[PDB]
Design a protein around this motif. Structure first.
Motif, PDB file in Angstrom:
ATOM      1  N   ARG A  83       1.463  -0.642   0.317  1.00 49.27           N
ATOM      2  CA  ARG A  83      -0.087   0.018  -0.048  1.00 49.27           C
ATOM      3  C   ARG A  83       1.221   1.274   0.003  1.00 49.27           C
ATOM      4  NH1 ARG A  83      -5.311  -1.688   0.641  1.00 49.27           N
ATOM      5  NH2 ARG A  83      -4.573  -2.865   3.134  1.00 49.27           N
ATOM      6  N   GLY A  84       2.190   1.366   0.709  1.00 52.43           N
ATOM      7  CA  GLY A  84       2.636   2.137   0.961  1.00 52.43           C
ATOM      8  C   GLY A  84       3.299   2.485  -0.041  1.00 52.43           C
ATOM      9  N   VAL A  85       3.960   1.746  -1.249  1.00 51.48           N
ATOM     10  CA  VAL A  85       4.470   1.718  -2.976  1.00 51.48           C
ATOM     11  C   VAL A  85       3.670   2.975  -2.866  1.00 51.48           C
ATOM     12  CG1 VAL A  85       4.960   0.380  -4.501  1.00 51.48           C
ATOM     13  CG2 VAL A  85       5.850  -0.530  -2.334  1.00 51.48           C
ATOM     14  N   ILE A  86       2.203   2.812  -3.316  1.00 48.70           N
ATOM     15  CA  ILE A  86       1.298   3.654  -4.109  1.00 48.70           C
ATOM     16  C   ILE A  86       1.717   4.863  -3.697  1.00 48.70           C
ATOM     17  CG2 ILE A  86      -0.757   3.353  -4.466  1.00 48.70           C
ATOM     18  CD1 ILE A  86      -1.578   0.538  -4.783  1.00 48.70           C
ATOM     19  N   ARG A  87       1.830   4.944  -1.640  1.00 48.96           N
ATOM     20  CA  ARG A  87       1.876   6.301  -1.879  1.00 48.96           C
ATOM     21  C   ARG A  87       3.219   6.703  -2.384  1.00 48.96           C
ATOM     22  NH1 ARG A  87       3.642   7.803   4.795  1.00 48.96           N
ATOM     23  NH2 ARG A  87       4.295  10.278   4.671  1.00 48.96           N
ATOM     24  N   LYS A  88       3.840   6.131  -1.687  1.00 47.59           N
ATOM     25  CA  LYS A  88       5.416   6.741  -2.633  1.00 47.59           C
ATOM     26  C   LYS A  88       5.378   6.888  -3.958  1.00 47.59           C
ATOM     27  CE  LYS A  88       9.914   7.737  -2.369  1.00 47.59           C
ATOM     28  NZ  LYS A  88      10.878   5.916  -2.341  1.00 47.59           N
ATOM     29  N   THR A 103      -1.571  12.343   0.596  1.00 48.56           N
ATOM     30  CA  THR A 103      -1.160  12.559   2.048  1.00 48.56           C
ATOM     31  C   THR A 103      -0.745  10.810   2.694  1.00 48.56           C
ATOM     32  OG1 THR A 103      -1.523  12.931   4.222  1.00 48.56           O
ATOM     33  CG2 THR A 103      -3.816  11.639   3.182  1.00 48.56           C
ATOM     34  N   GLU A 104      -0.481  10.702   4.150  1.00 48.81           N
ATOM     35  CA  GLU A 104       0.081   9.632   4.575  1.00 48.81           C
ATOM     36  C   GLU A 104      -0.755   8.383   4.417  1.00 48.81           C
ATOM     37  OE1 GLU A 104       0.173  11.448   7.765  1.00 48.81           O
ATOM     38  OE2 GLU A 104       2.019  10.794   9.093  1.00 48.81           O
ATOM     39  N   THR A 105      -2.610   9.350   4.753  1.00 48.25           N
ATOM     40  CA  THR A 105      -3.491   8.334   4.620  1.00 48.25           C
ATOM     41  C   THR A 105      -3.991   8.406   2.976  1.00 48.25           C
ATOM     42  OG1 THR A 105      -3.884   9.308   6.954  1.00 48.25           O
ATOM     43  CG2 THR A 105      -6.145   8.128   5.375  1.00 48.25           C
ATOM     44  N   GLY A 106      -4.103   8.841   2.089  1.00 52.71           N
ATOM     45  CA  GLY A 106      -5.096   9.041   0.653  1.00 52.71           C
ATOM     46  C   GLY A 106      -3.988   9.659   0.038  1.00 52.71           C
ATOM     47  N   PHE A 107      -4.396   9.966  -1.550  1.00 51.87           N
ATOM     48  CA  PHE A 107      -4.294  10.595  -1.771  1.00 51.87           C
ATOM     49  C   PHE A 107      -5.768  11.052  -2.697  1.00 51.87           C
ATOM     50  CE2 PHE A 107      -6.228   8.648  -6.940  1.00 51.87           C
ATOM     51  CZ  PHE A 107      -6.088   7.446  -5.644  1.00 51.87           C
ATOM     52  N   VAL A 138     -11.320  11.599  -2.467  1.00 53.56           N
ATOM     53  CA  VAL A 138     -10.234  11.832  -1.083  1.00 53.56           C
ATOM     54  C   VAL A 138     -10.428  10.149  -1.192  1.00 53.56           C
ATOM     55  CG1 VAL A 138      -9.483  11.670   1.064  1.00 53.56           C
ATOM     56  CG2 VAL A 138     -10.585  13.539  -0.430  1.00 53.56           C
ATOM     57  N   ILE A 139      -9.683   9.533  -2.099  1.00 51.38           N
ATOM     58  CA  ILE A 139      -9.277   7.397  -2.227  1.00 51.38           C
ATOM     59  C   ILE A 139      -8.321   7.851  -0.965  1.00 51.38           C
ATOM     60  CG2 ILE A 139      -9.171   5.692  -2.934  1.00 51.38           C
ATOM     61  CD1 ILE A 139      -9.804   6.978  -5.454  1.00 51.38           C
ATOM     62  N   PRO A 140      -8.710   6.684   0.371  1.00 47.58           N
ATOM     63  CA  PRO A 140      -7.540   6.325   1.389  1.00 47.58           C
ATOM     64  C   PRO A 140      -6.909   4.916   0.605  1.00 47.58           C
ATOM     65  CG  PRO A 140      -9.845   6.151   2.204  1.00 47.58           C
ATOM     66  CD  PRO A 140      -9.880   6.826   0.883  1.00 47.58           C
ATOM     67  N   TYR A 141      -5.515   4.561   0.962  1.00 48.99           N
ATOM     68  CA  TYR A 141      -4.784   3.567   0.423  1.00 48.99           C
ATOM     69  C   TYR A 141      -5.639   2.537   0.853  1.00 48.99           C
ATOM     70  CZ  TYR A 141      -1.848   7.284   0.352  1.00 48.99           C
ATOM     71  OH  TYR A 141      -1.038   8.552  -0.224  1.00 48.99           O
ATOM     72  N   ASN A 142      -6.457   2.370   2.044  1.00 47.78           N
ATOM     73  CA  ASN A 142      -6.949   0.539   2.684  1.00 47.78           C
ATOM     74  C   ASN A 142      -7.949   0.602   1.240  1.00 47.78           C
ATOM     75  OD1 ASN A 142      -8.196   3.574   4.576  1.00 47.78           O
ATOM     76  ND2 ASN A 142      -9.569   1.341   4.537  1.00 47.78           N
ATOM     77  N   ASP A 167      12.474  -3.434  -1.438  1.00 47.97           N
ATOM     78  CA  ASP A 167      12.254  -2.600  -0.356  1.00 47.97           C
ATOM     79  C   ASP A 167      11.015  -2.825   1.542  1.00 47.97           C
ATOM     80  OD1 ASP A 167      13.787   1.073   0.336  1.00 47.97           O
ATOM     81  OD2 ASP A 167      13.905  -0.818   1.868  1.00 47.97           O
ATOM     82  N   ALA A 168      10.164  -2.313   0.411  1.00 52.24           N
ATOM     83  CA  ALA A 168       8.738  -2.405   0.928  1.00 52.24           C
ATOM     84  C   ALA A 168       8.463  -3.923   1.629  1.00 52.24           C
ATOM     85  CB  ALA A 168       7.670  -1.880   0.295  1.00 52.24           C
ATOM     86  N   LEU A 169       8.801  -4.861   1.023  1.00 53.15           N
ATOM     87  CA  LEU A 169       8.879  -6.110   2.140  1.00 53.15           C
ATOM     88  C   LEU A 169       9.703  -6.505   1.877  1.00 53.15           C
ATOM     89  CD1 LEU A 169       6.817  -8.564  -1.117  1.00 53.15           C
ATOM     90  CD2 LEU A 169       6.630  -7.460   0.941  1.00 53.15           C
ATOM     91  N   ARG A 170      11.214  -6.118   2.124  1.00 55.82           N
ATOM     92  CA  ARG A 170      12.253  -6.346   3.270  1.00 55.82           C
ATOM     93  C   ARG A 170      11.510  -5.404   4.392  1.00 55.82           C
ATOM     94  NH1 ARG A 170      17.233  -7.552   0.406  1.00 55.82           N
ATOM     95  NH2 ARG A 170      16.650  -5.957  -1.035  1.00 55.82           N
ATOM     96  N   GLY A 171      11.061  -4.412   4.597  1.00 51.78           N
ATOM     97  CA  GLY A 171      10.408  -3.698   5.367  1.00 51.78           C
ATOM     98  C   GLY A 171       9.691  -4.467   6.111  1.00 51.78           C
ATOM     99  N   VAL A 172       8.669  -5.741   5.352  1.00 56.08           N
ATOM    100  CA  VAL A 172       7.937  -6.172   6.581  1.00 56.08           C
ATOM    101  C   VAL A 172       8.867  -7.156   7.822  1.00 56.08           C
ATOM    102  CG1 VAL A 172       6.866  -8.099   6.774  1.00 56.08           C
ATOM    103  CG2 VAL A 172       6.483  -6.332   5.172  1.00 56.08           C
TER     104      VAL A 172
END
Lengths: 115, 117
Positions: free
Chosen positions: A14-19, A75-79, A93-97, B12-17
């Motif tokens: 999920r956090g990859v999509i954020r980045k 944002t850390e929560t969504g885009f 506003v679409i939260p990642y989850n 890197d994300a999974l490495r983070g797990v």
């Protein structure tokens, strides 16, 4: 079973999509011939839509961030993004989850989640 | 033409797990439930700190098992440190996260692989 690898992985991904869209919004422009097909849950918590759109995609809608989109903030929560429609400007506003699928065809990349 | 490199970002994300999981265990000092990890790494990669005993017994790759007898696990920023016993001689291992090639948890059939070289 005390470890929820599945959750951990999906938050990580999920956090990859954020980045990613996080740096697409930084420059306002989308790199090379890239573009995303983000599929989300219109009724998921945290989602901010309009009765208009919700009365159009009751369960899940699939936006497409390409050539030119607007107001994308991440944002850390969504885009948050702008989505010019045939008859009205929309801002969701679409939260990642809430995302259940991320697809980038330029490099044939696909993510899928359990919603 | 890839300008984003999802693979490097997913890796890197999974490495983070592996970091938060190993980090959670290093905290308490015990694996939860039936969880145990098979961690395979490059004994040659930089930042790796193992004894002549083990570096000679194992050429380039090595799979360690964290299950019953481990001590002094310290998760750091670069990687982690673990104490296990090999053929009855205690050992101290320093494994940088980027040296890990694979991570497997037989308990819940969860495996992760990376481009360790």
């Amino acid at each position: 079973d005390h470890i929820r690898y599945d959750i951990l992985a999906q938050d990580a991904l999920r956090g990859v999509i954020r980045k990613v869209l996080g740096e697409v919004a930084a420059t306002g422009r989308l790199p090379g011939d890239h573009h995303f097909f983000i599929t989300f849950l219109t009724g998921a918590p945290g989602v901010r839509i309009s009765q208009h759109l919700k009365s159009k995609y009751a369960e899940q809608m699939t936006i497409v961030i390409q050539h030119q989109f607007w107001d994308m903030k991440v944002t850390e929560t969504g885009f948050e993004i702008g989505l010019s429609f045939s008859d009205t400007p929309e801002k969701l506003v679409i939260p990642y989850n809430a995302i259940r699928g991320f697809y980038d065809p330029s490099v044939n990349f696909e993510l899928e989640f359990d919603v």
